[PDB]
Amino acid sequence: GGRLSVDASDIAEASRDFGGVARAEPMAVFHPRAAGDVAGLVGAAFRSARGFRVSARGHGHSISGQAQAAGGVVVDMSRAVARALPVHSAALGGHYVDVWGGELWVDVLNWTLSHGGLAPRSWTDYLYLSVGGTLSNAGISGQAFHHGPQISNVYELDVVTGKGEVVTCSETENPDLFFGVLGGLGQFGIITRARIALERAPKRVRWIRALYSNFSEFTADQERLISLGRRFDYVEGFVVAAESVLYCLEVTKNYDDETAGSVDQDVDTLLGELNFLPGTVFTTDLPYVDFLDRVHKAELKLRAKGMWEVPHPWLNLFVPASRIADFDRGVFRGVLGAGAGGPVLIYPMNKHKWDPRSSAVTPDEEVFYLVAFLRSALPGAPESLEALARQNQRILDFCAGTGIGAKQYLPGHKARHEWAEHFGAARWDRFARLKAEFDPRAILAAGQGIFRPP
Ligand SMILES: *Cc1cc2c(cc1C)nc1c(=O)[nH]c(=O)nc-1n2C[C@H](O)[C@H](O)[C@H](O)COP(=O)(O)OP(=O)(O)OC[C@H]1O[C@@H](n2cnc3c(N)ncnc32)[C@H](O)[C@@H]1O
Ligand SMILES: COc1ccc(C(N)=O)c(NC(=O)Nc2cc(Cl)cc(Cl)c2)c1
């Protein structure tokens, strides 16, 4: 059904990612038409003498070669095929949609909006990411404190295991595979279908930004907002340079024709309870799609300046809320106190919205922060990348030296002792047992560098 390609442009694309550093080349790129084609290719890898590497590639947004299959085959999941319409279930008390694992979230959104004005409840900041790609990590943005990550908003999957078997799984059917695959770093199979939870979409968004010079007030306000009854629909934050540091609180209030009459007062009532710097509230009113696509708009401006296809040594940490104050002292004021620049995100989430049965690794605390160092290197300047990589190592050394129980999100670990420390004994045992069962020859997502063939 599918076709193997040796087109130099296809090989080149499959040999790189957004990080712009890892460059392991496959032998060929596979273009599947359906799940059976993926199953066929993985089955052939499983039965082969050498057991060649197979990795699914979503939109290639990995930072350190996680979707690369050195001397093997990269499955281009991007894909004429007919899409499933959203469905209502009286039993689940809501809607869902089945999507191909390679579908981009921006295309899922456009589809669900045009078919009943429905949308996923939990997002990433950037929608040109694949469903299977975010579901293999977590998929987080300003809605996760309330709805949980995208891995907490999926009902069912079809997975092609490392043995080339197509398996339908959910909480009630093959749950070990379902929960293993969710946040599973592509280690147990390729997601060919995901059943995404949907809600009736808002039409518009009241997008607010407010400034803080006091980090204690900033974090106290973020933590109070995520515990909220009247509440914001989105809670994020970012660190801003003086032109020493400021913190920007970023919130939204979603609304439609029915709630348009109460949005101004809901916002004013919520903002009144906060302690941001007076006169620093910036507001925008825009369609829901436009708000969700905000990072793609930043992307177009970077592409125009030749500032998009540069190295991205991005670092993402989950930091226990009990250690966030020390974190600002030694990192935002200490280590960072730049390259082409880029955002430094910071916002808390509620651990109870994350199912503990999944493969996702979070700190052992009820409230934890995402701290995202999204700094880009200068174009064609290798020394800028090297200086940023040294800064990233200083941040990790800071966490290690003061015993901050931080965990990397999209973990860039390479050594077995680093992976054992990341997971901890209980989670590592569960992870290794799932690998022995679903990918014994370690064919899948070998670019993650967790397992090697036996
Ligand atoms: C580049 C980028 C990334 C990003 C983001 C904004 C940008 C500009 N915003 C994010 C956000 O707000 N929140 C968040 O949670 N993540 C965000 N990211 C990171 C992004 O989630 C990751 O890069 C992720 O890997 C998804 O990206 P993509 O769709 O491109 O997937 P990939 O890089 O090619 O592959 C990642 C790993 O998963 C395996 N894989 C890929 N597809 C599948 C399927 N269908 N089934 C199973 N495994 C799959 C790859 O082999 C690789 O190991
Ligand atoms: C230059 O590209 C930009 C510009 C702006 C943003 C933003 N405002 O969120 C943006 N946001 C992200 O990339 N967020 C994101 C990126 C990763 Cl890799 C992981 C997670 Cl938790 C968040 C990227």
Coordinates of C-alpha atoms and ligand atoms in Angstrom, one line a residue:
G1 CA 0.0 0.0 0.0
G2 CA 2.8 2.4 1.0
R3 CA 6.0 3.5 -0.8
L4 CA 9.7 3.5 0.2
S5 CA 11.5 6.7 -1.0
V6 CA 15.2 7.4 -1.4
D7 CA 14.5 11.0 -2.7
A8 CA 17.5 13.1 -1.3
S9 CA 15.0 15.8 -0.2
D10 CA 13.0 13.1 1.8
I11 CA 16.2 11.6 3.3
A12 CA 17.5 15.1 4.2
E13 CA 14.1 16.1 6.0
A14 CA 14.1 12.7 7.9
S15 CA 17.8 13.3 8.9
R16 CA 17.0 16.6 10.7
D17 CA 14.7 18.2 13.3
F18 CA 13.8 21.6 14.7
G19 CA 16.8 21.3 17.2
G20 CA 19.1 21.5 14.2
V21 CA 21.9 19.4 15.8
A22 CA 21.1 15.7 15.6
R23 CA 21.6 14.4 12.0
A24 CA 21.3 10.6 11.9
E25 CA 20.3 9.5 8.3
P26 CA 17.9 6.6 7.6
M27 CA 18.3 4.3 4.5
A28 CA 14.8 5.2 3.2
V29 CA 11.6 7.2 4.1
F30 CA 8.3 5.3 4.2
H31 CA 5.1 7.0 3.1
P32 CA 2.1 5.0 4.4
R33 CA -1.5 5.2 3.0
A34 CA -3.0 3.5 6.1
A35 CA -2.3 1.7 9.4
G36 CA -1.7 -1.7 7.7
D37 CA 1.2 -0.2 5.7
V38 CA 2.9 1.0 9.0
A39 CA 2.2 -2.5 10.5
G40 CA 3.7 -4.1 7.4
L41 CA 6.9 -2.1 7.6
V42 CA 7.3 -2.6 11.4
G43 CA 6.5 -6.3 11.0
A44 CA 9.3 -6.6 8.3
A45 CA 11.8 -4.8 10.7
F46 CA 10.7 -7.2 13.5
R47 CA 11.2 -10.3 11.3
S48 CA 14.4 -9.0 9.6
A49 CA 17.8 -10.6 10.6
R50 CA 19.5 -7.2 11.5
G51 CA 16.3 -5.7 13.0
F52 CA 16.6 -2.2 11.3
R53 CA 15.4 0.9 13.2
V54 CA 11.9 2.3 12.5
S55 CA 10.8 5.7 13.7
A56 CA 7.7 7.7 13.1
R57 CA 8.2 11.4 12.2
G58 CA 5.4 13.8 13.0
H59 CA 6.3 17.4 12.0
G60 CA 10.0 17.0 13.0
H61 CA 9.8 19.3 16.0
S62 CA 12.2 17.1 18.2
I63 CA 15.2 19.0 19.7
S64 CA 17.8 16.1 19.8
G65 CA 17.0 13.5 17.2
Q66 CA 14.2 11.7 18.9
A67 CA 12.4 10.9 15.5
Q68 CA 15.7 9.8 13.7
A69 CA 16.2 6.1 12.7
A70 CA 20.0 5.7 11.9
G71 CA 20.4 3.4 8.9
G72 CA 16.8 2.3 9.1
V73 CA 13.4 3.7 8.0
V74 CA 11.7 6.9 9.0
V75 CA 7.8 6.7 8.6
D76 CA 6.7 10.1 7.3
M77 CA 3.3 10.2 9.2
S78 CA 2.2 13.5 7.5
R79 CA 0.4 11.8 4.5
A80 CA -6.8 12.1 -0.6
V81 CA -7.8 10.0 2.5
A82 CA -11.3 10.5 4.1
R83 CA -11.4 11.9 7.6
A84 CA -13.7 10.7 10.4
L85 CA -16.4 13.2 11.5
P86 CA -16.8 14.1 15.2
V87 CA -19.2 11.8 17.0
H88 CA -21.4 12.3 20.1
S89 CA -21.6 9.6 22.7
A90 CA -24.4 9.6 25.3
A91 CA -22.2 7.2 27.4
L92 CA -19.1 9.5 27.7
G93 CA -21.4 12.6 27.9
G94 CA -19.6 14.3 25.1
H95 CA -18.0 14.3 21.6
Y96 CA -14.8 12.8 20.2
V97 CA -13.0 12.6 16.9
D98 CA -10.8 9.8 15.5
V99 CA -7.7 11.3 13.8
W100 CA -4.7 9.7 11.9
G101 CA -1.6 9.8 14.3
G102 CA 0.3 12.0 11.8
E103 CA -2.5 14.6 11.6
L104 CA -1.4 18.1 12.7
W105 CA -3.3 19.8 15.6
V106 CA -4.0 22.9 13.3
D107 CA -5.8 20.6 10.8
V108 CA -7.7 18.7 13.6
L109 CA -9.0 22.1 14.9
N110 CA -10.1 23.3 11.4
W111 CA -11.9 20.0 10.8
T112 CA -13.7 19.9 14.2
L113 CA -14.7 23.6 13.9
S114 CA -16.2 23.1 10.4
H115 CA -18.1 19.9 11.7
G116 CA -20.2 21.2 14.6
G117 CA -18.1 24.0 16.0
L118 CA -16.2 21.5 18.2
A119 CA -12.6 21.6 19.4
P120 CA -10.0 19.8 21.6
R121 CA -10.0 21.2 25.2
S122 CA -6.2 20.9 25.8
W123 CA -3.6 22.4 23.6
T124 CA 0.1 23.0 22.8
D125 CA 1.3 26.7 22.2
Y126 CA 2.1 25.6 18.6
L127 CA -0.4 23.7 16.5
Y128 CA 1.9 22.5 13.6
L129 CA 2.7 19.4 15.7
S130 CA 1.4 15.9 15.1
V131 CA -1.1 14.2 17.3
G132 CA 1.0 11.1 17.8
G133 CA 4.1 13.3 18.5
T134 CA 2.5 15.3 21.4
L135 CA 0.7 12.2 22.7
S136 CA 4.1 10.5 23.0
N137 CA 5.2 13.4 25.3
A138 CA 2.3 15.1 27.1
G139 CA 1.1 18.1 25.1
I140 CA 0.9 21.1 27.4
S141 CA -0.2 24.8 27.2
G142 CA -2.2 27.2 29.4
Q143 CA -5.3 24.8 29.6
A144 CA -3.4 21.9 31.2
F145 CA -3.9 23.2 34.8
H146 CA -7.7 22.6 34.3
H147 CA -8.1 19.9 31.5
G148 CA -4.7 18.2 32.1
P149 CA -2.2 17.6 29.2
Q150 CA -3.4 16.3 25.8
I151 CA -2.5 12.7 27.2
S152 CA -5.4 13.2 29.7
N153 CA -7.9 14.1 26.8
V154 CA -7.7 11.0 24.7
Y155 CA -10.2 8.1 24.9
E156 CA -8.6 5.4 22.7
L157 CA -5.7 4.6 20.3
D158 CA -4.8 2.3 17.6
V159 CA -1.1 1.4 18.0
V160 CA 1.2 -0.6 15.7
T161 CA 3.5 -2.3 18.3
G162 CA 7.3 -3.1 17.8
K163 CA 6.1 -6.6 16.7
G164 CA 4.0 -5.0 13.8
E165 CA 0.7 -5.9 15.4
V166 CA -2.2 -3.3 15.2
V167 CA -3.8 -3.0 18.7
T168 CA -6.8 -1.0 19.8
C169 CA -6.3 0.2 23.3
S170 CA -8.0 2.4 26.0
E171 CA -8.6 2.4 29.8
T172 CA -10.9 -0.7 29.4
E173 CA -9.1 -2.5 26.6
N174 CA -5.3 -3.3 26.7
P175 CA -4.8 -0.5 29.3
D176 CA -1.1 -1.3 29.9
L177 CA -0.4 -0.5 26.2
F178 CA -2.7 2.6 26.2
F179 CA -1.2 4.2 29.3
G180 CA 2.3 3.0 28.3
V181 CA 2.1 4.7 24.9
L182 CA 0.8 8.0 26.4
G183 CA 3.9 10.0 27.3
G184 CA 5.8 6.8 26.2
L185 CA 8.4 8.5 23.9
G186 CA 7.4 6.3 21.0
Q187 CA 8.9 3.3 22.8
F188 CA 6.0 0.8 22.6
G189 CA 4.4 1.5 19.2
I190 CA 3.4 4.0 16.5
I191 CA 0.0 5.7 17.1
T192 CA -2.1 5.3 13.9
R193 CA -5.4 6.5 15.4
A194 CA -6.2 8.7 18.4
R195 CA -9.7 9.4 19.7
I196 CA -9.6 13.0 20.9
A197 CA -12.0 14.4 23.4
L198 CA -13.9 17.6 22.2
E199 CA -15.9 20.4 23.6
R200 CA -18.1 23.0 22.0
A201 CA -15.6 25.6 21.0
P202 CA -15.7 29.3 22.2
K203 CA -15.9 31.8 19.3
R204 CA -13.6 34.5 20.8
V205 CA -10.9 35.0 23.4
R206 CA -10.2 38.0 25.7
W207 CA -6.3 37.7 25.8
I208 CA -4.7 39.5 28.7
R209 CA -1.0 40.2 29.7
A210 CA 0.1 41.9 33.0
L211 CA 3.6 42.7 34.4
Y212 CA 5.2 41.9 37.7
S213 CA 8.6 43.0 39.1
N214 CA 8.1 40.8 42.2
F215 CA 8.6 37.0 41.6
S216 CA 6.9 36.1 44.9
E217 CA 3.7 38.0 43.9
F218 CA 3.9 36.6 40.3
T219 CA 4.1 32.9 41.4
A220 CA 1.5 33.4 44.2
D221 CA -0.9 34.9 41.6
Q222 CA -0.2 32.0 39.1
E223 CA -0.7 29.4 41.8
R224 CA -4.0 31.0 43.0
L225 CA -5.3 31.2 39.4
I226 CA -4.6 27.5 38.7
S227 CA -6.6 26.5 41.9
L228 CA -9.8 28.3 40.8
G229 CA -16.6 29.1 40.0
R230 CA -15.1 32.0 38.0
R231 CA -11.7 31.3 36.4
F232 CA -9.5 32.0 33.4
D233 CA -9.4 29.3 30.6
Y234 CA -5.7 29.7 30.1
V235 CA -2.8 30.5 32.5
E236 CA 0.8 31.0 31.2
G237 CA 3.7 33.3 32.1
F238 CA 7.1 34.4 30.7
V239 CA 10.3 36.1 31.9
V240 CA 11.0 39.5 30.3
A241 CA 14.3 41.4 30.0
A242 CA 14.3 45.0 31.6
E243 CA 14.4 47.0 28.2
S244 CA 16.6 43.7 36.1
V245 CA 13.9 41.1 35.0
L246 CA 10.1 41.3 34.8
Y247 CA 7.5 38.5 34.7
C248 CA 4.5 38.6 32.5
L249 CA 1.3 36.9 33.5
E250 CA -0.7 35.7 30.4
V251 CA -4.3 34.8 30.8
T252 CA -7.4 34.3 28.6
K253 CA -11.2 34.3 29.1
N254 CA -13.0 32.2 26.3
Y255 CA -16.5 33.3 25.2
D256 CA -19.3 32.9 22.6
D257 CA -22.6 34.8 21.7
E258 CA -24.3 33.5 25.0
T259 CA -21.4 34.7 27.3
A260 CA -20.4 37.9 25.4
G261 CA -22.5 40.1 27.8
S262 CA -20.7 38.9 30.9
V263 CA -17.1 38.6 29.6
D264 CA -16.0 42.2 30.5
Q265 CA -17.2 41.8 34.2
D266 CA -15.8 38.3 34.6
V267 CA -12.4 39.6 33.5
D268 CA -12.5 42.8 35.6
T269 CA -13.6 40.7 38.7
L270 CA -10.8 38.2 38.2
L271 CA -8.1 40.9 37.5
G272 CA -9.2 42.9 40.6
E273 CA -8.2 40.0 42.9
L274 CA -4.6 40.0 41.3
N275 CA -1.4 41.9 42.4
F276 CA 0.2 42.9 39.0
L277 CA 1.9 46.3 38.5
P278 CA -0.9 48.9 38.0
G279 CA -1.0 50.3 34.4
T280 CA 0.6 47.2 32.8
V281 CA -2.5 45.3 31.7
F282 CA -2.5 44.8 27.9
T283 CA -5.7 43.3 26.3
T284 CA -6.5 41.8 22.8
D285 CA -9.9 40.5 21.6
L286 CA -9.7 38.0 18.8
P287 CA -11.2 34.8 17.3
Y288 CA -10.4 31.4 19.1
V289 CA -8.5 30.1 16.0
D290 CA -6.4 33.2 15.8
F291 CA -5.4 33.0 19.5
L292 CA -4.5 29.3 19.1
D293 CA -2.5 30.0 16.0
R294 CA -0.4 32.9 17.7
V295 CA 2.9 31.0 17.6
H296 CA 2.5 30.2 13.8
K297 CA 2.2 34.0 13.3
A298 CA 5.5 34.5 15.2
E299 CA 7.0 31.7 12.9
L300 CA 6.1 33.6 9.7
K301 CA 7.9 36.7 11.0
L302 CA 11.0 34.6 11.9
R303 CA 11.0 32.9 8.5
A304 CA 10.9 36.4 6.8
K305 CA 14.1 37.4 8.7
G306 CA 15.9 34.0 8.1
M307 CA 15.6 33.4 11.9
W308 CA 13.5 30.2 11.9
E309 CA 15.8 27.6 10.4
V310 CA 18.5 28.0 13.0
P311 CA 19.6 25.7 15.9
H312 CA 17.1 25.5 18.7
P313 CA 18.9 24.2 21.9
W314 CA 15.5 24.3 23.8
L315 CA 15.4 23.0 27.4
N316 CA 12.1 22.2 29.2
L317 CA 11.9 21.5 32.9
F318 CA 9.2 20.5 35.3
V319 CA 10.1 22.1 38.6
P320 CA 8.4 21.4 42.0
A321 CA 6.5 24.5 43.2
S322 CA 8.3 24.1 46.6
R323 CA 11.6 25.0 44.8
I324 CA 10.5 27.6 42.3
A325 CA 11.6 30.6 44.5
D326 CA 15.3 29.3 44.6
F327 CA 14.9 28.6 40.9
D328 CA 14.4 32.3 40.0
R329 CA 17.3 33.4 42.3
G330 CA 19.9 31.1 40.7
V331 CA 18.6 30.9 37.1
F332 CA 16.6 33.9 35.9
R333 CA 18.8 36.3 37.9
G334 CA 21.9 34.0 38.2
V335 CA 22.7 31.9 35.1
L336 CA 20.7 34.0 32.5
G337 CA 21.4 37.3 34.4
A338 CA 20.9 35.1 25.0
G339 CA 21.7 34.5 21.2
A340 CA 18.9 35.5 18.8
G341 CA 16.7 35.5 21.9
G342 CA 13.4 33.6 22.3
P343 CA 10.9 33.1 25.1
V344 CA 11.5 31.8 28.6
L345 CA 8.0 30.3 29.7
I346 CA 7.0 29.7 33.3
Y347 CA 3.7 28.5 34.6
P348 CA 2.3 26.0 37.2
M349 CA 0.1 22.9 36.6
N350 CA -1.9 20.5 38.9
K351 CA -0.5 17.0 39.1
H352 CA -4.1 15.5 39.8
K353 CA -5.0 16.2 36.1
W354 CA -2.2 13.8 35.0
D355 CA -3.1 10.1 35.2
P356 CA -0.3 8.4 37.2
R357 CA -0.7 5.2 35.1
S358 CA 0.8 7.0 32.0
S359 CA 4.5 6.9 31.0
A360 CA 4.8 10.7 31.6
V361 CA 7.3 11.8 34.3
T362 CA 6.4 14.6 36.5
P363 CA 7.9 15.9 39.9
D364 CA 6.5 14.2 43.0
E365 CA 4.6 17.3 44.1
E366 CA 0.9 18.4 43.6
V367 CA 1.8 21.7 42.0
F368 CA 4.8 21.9 39.6
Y369 CA 5.9 24.5 37.0
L370 CA 6.9 24.2 33.4
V371 CA 10.1 26.3 32.9
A372 CA 10.8 26.4 29.2
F373 CA 14.1 27.9 27.9
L374 CA 13.2 28.5 24.2
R375 CA 16.2 30.4 23.2
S376 CA 17.5 30.2 19.6
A377 CA 21.1 30.4 18.3
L378 CA 22.2 33.2 15.9
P379 CA 22.0 32.1 12.2
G380 CA 25.1 30.5 10.8
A381 CA 27.0 31.2 14.2
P382 CA 28.0 27.8 15.7
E383 CA 29.5 29.6 18.8
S384 CA 26.0 31.0 19.7
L385 CA 24.7 27.4 19.9
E386 CA 27.7 26.4 22.0
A387 CA 27.2 29.3 24.5
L388 CA 23.5 28.4 24.8
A389 CA 24.3 24.7 25.4
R390 CA 26.8 25.8 28.2
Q391 CA 23.9 27.9 29.7
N392 CA 21.6 24.8 29.6
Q393 CA 24.2 22.7 31.3
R394 CA 24.6 25.4 34.1
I395 CA 20.8 25.3 34.6
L396 CA 20.9 21.5 35.0
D397 CA 24.0 21.7 37.3
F398 CA 22.1 24.3 39.4
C399 CA 19.1 22.0 39.9
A400 CA 21.5 19.1 40.7
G401 CA 23.7 21.1 43.1
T402 CA 20.7 22.4 45.2
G403 CA 18.8 19.1 45.1
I404 CA 15.8 20.5 43.1
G405 CA 13.8 17.5 42.1
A406 CA 13.2 18.9 38.6
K407 CA 12.4 16.5 35.6
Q408 CA 13.1 17.2 32.0
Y409 CA 10.0 17.3 29.7
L410 CA 11.0 16.0 26.1
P411 CA 14.0 14.4 28.0
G412 CA 17.3 14.8 26.2
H413 CA 19.0 12.0 28.3
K414 CA 21.5 9.7 26.6
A415 CA 23.0 7.4 29.4
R416 CA 21.3 4.5 31.2
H417 CA 22.0 5.9 34.7
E418 CA 20.5 9.3 33.5
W419 CA 17.3 7.5 32.4
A420 CA 17.1 5.4 35.6
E421 CA 17.4 8.6 37.7
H422 CA 14.7 10.4 35.4
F423 CA 12.1 7.6 35.9
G424 CA 13.1 6.4 39.4
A425 CA 13.0 2.6 40.3
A426 CA 9.2 1.9 40.1
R427 CA 8.5 3.8 36.8
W428 CA 11.8 2.4 35.3
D429 CA 10.7 -1.2 36.1
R430 CA 7.2 -0.5 34.5
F431 CA 8.9 1.1 31.4
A432 CA 11.4 -1.7 30.8
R433 CA 8.6 -4.4 31.3
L434 CA 6.5 -2.6 28.7
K435 CA 9.5 -2.5 26.3
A436 CA 10.2 -6.3 26.7
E437 CA 6.5 -6.9 25.8
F438 CA 5.8 -4.4 23.0
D439 CA 9.3 -3.7 21.4
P440 CA 11.7 -6.5 22.4
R441 CA 14.1 -5.8 19.6
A442 CA 14.2 -2.0 20.4
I443 CA 13.3 -1.1 16.8
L444 CA 11.0 1.9 17.6
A445 CA 12.0 5.5 18.4
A446 CA 15.7 4.4 19.0
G447 CA 16.7 8.1 18.5
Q448 CA 15.4 8.7 22.1
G449 CA 18.5 6.6 23.2
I450 CA 16.8 4.7 26.0
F451 CA 17.2 1.0 24.8
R452 CA 19.6 -0.8 22.4
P453 CA 18.8 -4.2 20.6
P454 CA 19.3 -7.3 22.7
Ligands
LIG1 C1 9.2 22.9 17.5 C2 8.1 23.2 18.6 C3 7.8 22.2 19.5 C4 6.9 22.4 20.5 C5 6.2 23.6 20.6 C6 6.5 24.6 19.7 C7 7.5 24.4 18.7 C8 7.9 25.6 17.8 N1 5.2 23.9 21.5 C9 4.9 23.0 22.4 C10 4.0 23.3 23.5 O1 3.5 24.3 23.7 N2 3.7 22.2 24.3 C11 4.3 20.9 24.2 O2 3.8 20.1 25.0 N3 5.2 20.7 23.3 C12 5.6 21.7 22.4 N4 6.5 21.4 21.5 C13 7.2 20.1 21.6 C14 6.6 19.0 20.8 O3 5.4 18.5 21.6 C15 7.5 17.9 20.5 O4 8.5 18.3 19.6 C16 6.9 16.5 20.1 O5 7.9 15.6 19.7 C17 5.9 16.7 19.0 O6 6.5 17.1 17.8 P1 6.3 16.3 16.4 O7 4.8 16.1 16.0 O8 7.0 17.0 15.3 O9 6.9 14.8 16.6 P2 8.4 14.3 16.2 O10 9.3 15.4 16.7 O11 8.5 14.1 14.7 O12 8.5 13.0 17.1 C18 8.7 13.0 18.5 C19 8.8 11.6 19.1 O13 7.6 10.9 18.9 C20 7.7 9.8 18.0 N5 6.5 9.8 17.2 C21 6.1 10.7 16.2 N6 4.9 10.4 15.7 C22 4.5 9.3 16.4 C23 3.4 8.5 16.3 N7 2.3 8.7 15.5 N8 3.3 7.4 17.2 C24 4.3 7.2 18.0 N9 5.4 7.8 18.1 C25 5.5 8.9 17.3 C26 9.0 10.1 17.2 O14 9.6 8.9 16.7 C27 9.9 10.8 18.3 O15 10.4 9.8 19.2
LIG2 C1 10.1 31.0 18.5 O1 9.0 30.2 18.7 C2 8.1 30.5 19.8 C3 7.6 31.8 20.0 C4 6.7 32.0 21.0 C5 6.2 30.9 21.8 C6 5.3 31.2 22.9 N1 4.8 32.6 23.2 O2 4.7 30.4 23.6 C7 6.6 29.6 21.5 N2 6.2 28.6 22.4 C8 6.8 27.3 22.4 O3 7.6 26.9 21.7 N3 6.3 26.5 23.6 C9 6.8 25.2 23.9 C10 7.9 24.6 23.3 C11 8.3 23.4 23.7 CL1 9.6 22.5 22.8 C12 7.8 22.8 24.9 C13 6.8 23.5 25.5 CL2 6.1 22.8 27.0 C14 6.4 24.7 25.1 C15 7.6 29.4 20.5

